[PDB]
Amino acid sequence: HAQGTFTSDYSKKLDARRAQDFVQWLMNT
Ligand SMILES: *C(=O)CC[C@H](NC(=O)CC[C@H](NC(=O)CCCCCCCCCCCCCCC)C(=O)O)C(=O)O
Structure with a gap:
């Protein structure tokens, strides 16, 4: 991959x- x-x-x-919140994309979901 x-x-x-x-x-x-x-x-x-x-x-x-x-922005950077992306890190949360696969975390707070
Ligand atoms: C702009 O948005 C570009 C077009 C479009 N973008 C998006 O999809 C937004 C994010 C983009 N695409 C991805 O989502 C692809 C990322 C790979 C799938 C996620 C797998 C899990 C990630 C795990 C991270 C672990 C950390 C390892 C150290 C680096 C993007 O990737 O930015 C597009 O065509 O995708």
């Missing part, structure tokens, strides 16, 4: 889009 959770920027586009 390549979650790209990181390079999701140089690959998809922007990363800080979720």
Whole structure:
């Protein structure tokens, strides 16, 4: 895999889009 959770920027586009709370994405769900 390549979650790209990181390079999701140089690959998809922007990363800080979720600001950073993304960490909660797979935690508070
Ligand atoms: C902008 O939104 C880009 C287009 C679109 N974006 C999204 O889907 C939003 C996030 C984006 N895509 C992902 O969700 C893909 C991430 C991989 C799936 C998650 C697996 C679990 C992650 C576990 C993290 C463990 C930490 C390891 C250390 C790095 C993105 O990835 O940013 C898009 O096309 O996806």
